[PDB]
Design a protein around this ligand. Structure first.
Ligand SMILES: O=C(O)C(=O)Cc1ccc(O)cc1
Ligand SMILES: [Pr+3]
Length: 357
């Protein structure tokens, strides 16, 4: 009578810094929901889309999963969503992705959508005298989501995009891209990357004498960024989920209690400042399950296709789902389901994250 949840995340390779906290956070989620035990099957995919496809396929067929979850970065998350939408199994994505008609029916997304994160960054650029903006980001759909958003929102707000450079996830140098960005000398540069890679343009730009403002995505929101960037991290502007600072929230924020619950558990085990954007997502996915499971049980039983459907329909009917990273209300067309309560703006002062109000 167990409910089966298959989870594929990235605990090896360049994106381990994202998947490791995601896996680690599972220690702190409910393993009994709606009066049923939860059976979790957790597999590494190394960030590889083929491996992620394979993991997801096996969860849905061999493990007869009721829900599948993952992956840690966009390319394998697209792969998982494609399996979910063909096999007709609810999928909770732990990385942002382009939600096309192919993907929208069966996938919902825990991380904040790019445009919400972009808007807070671009409003800061406007307030801080920025006229020209350069971009460096992955040469894949994550880097595309961010560049497209920068151009679309940015130009509408009167910013001028003056350079675009890309680099691949495994790359350890961005020398050629930085040379071009430095020569263009934009007032600000947006880095579209994540984890350890996000710190690569941060250090390379400062080392080459760039003095403009540097903006980072929510893909950079863990202590790994400050560890790796060092002094180059100072003064960065970074979009983040609210889980990075539940202490600072008003008691009236529905995200405060779940943020405090997660962070107290996580930091007790893993040490000071070990909170992350990413631990927030897997923890939140279970907050979502705690709302939708008891609703699905009213009409269906675990291990059937009807239960998959009932969960999918509950995702549409259950509104205002409180979690550490925001308050979720999904629709047929909005698979992120988040608003302004799902983001804050961080900077780094003396090796510590601080909120910019
Ligand atoms: O690198 C990638 O592809 C990402 O998708 C990283 C990422 C993961 C979770 C977030 O909340 C923000 C960005
Ligand atoms: Pr029935």
């Amino acid at each position: 009578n167990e409910i089966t949840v298959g989870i594929t995340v990235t605990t090896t390779g360049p994106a381990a810094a994202l998947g490791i906290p995601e896996r680690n956070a599972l220690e702190f989620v409910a393993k009994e929901i709606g009066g049923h035990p939860i059976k979790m099957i957790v597999l590494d995919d190394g960030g590889d889309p083929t491996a992620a496809t394979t993991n997801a396929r096996r969860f849905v067929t061999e493990s007869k999963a009721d829900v599948i979850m993952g992956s840690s970065v966009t390319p394998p998350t697209v792969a998982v969503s494609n399996v979910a939408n063909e096999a007709q199994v609810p999928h909770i994505a732990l990385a942002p992705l382009p939600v096309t008609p192919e993907r929208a029916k069966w996938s919902v997304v825990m991380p904040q959508p790019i445009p919400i994160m972009g808007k807070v960054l671009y409003e800061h650029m406007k307030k801080n005298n920025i006229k020209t903006v350069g971009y460096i980001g992955y040469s894949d759909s994550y880097g595309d989501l961010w560049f497209n958003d920068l151009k679309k929102q940015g130009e509408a707000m009167g910013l001028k995009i003056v350079a675009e450079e890309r680099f691949a996830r495994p790359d350890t140098s961005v020398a050629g891209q930085v040379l071009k960005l430095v020569a263009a000398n934009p007032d600000a540069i947006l880095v579209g990357a994540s984890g350890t890679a996000a710190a690569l343009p941060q250090t390379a730009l400062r080392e080459r004498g760039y003095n403009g403002l540097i903006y980072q995505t929510h893909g950079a929101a863990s202590m790994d960024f400050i560890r790796i960037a060092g002094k180059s991290a100072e003064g960065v502007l970074m979009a983040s989920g609210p889980v990075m600072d539940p202490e600072g929230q008003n008691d009236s924020a529905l995200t405060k209690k779940p943020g405090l619950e997660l962070n107290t558990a996580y930091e007790t085990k893993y040490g000071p400042n070990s909170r992350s954007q990413f631990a927030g997502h897997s923890f939140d996915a279970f907050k979502v399950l705690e709302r939708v499971i008891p609703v699905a049980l009213k009409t269906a039983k675990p291990g059937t296709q009807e239960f998959r459907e009932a969960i999918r329909k509950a995702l549409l009917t259950e509104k205002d789902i409180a979690a550490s990273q925001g308050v979720y209300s999904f629709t047929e067309t909005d698979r992120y389901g988040l608003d302004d309560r799902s983001r804050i703006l961080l900077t780094v002062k003396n090796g510590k994250y601080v909120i910019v109000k």
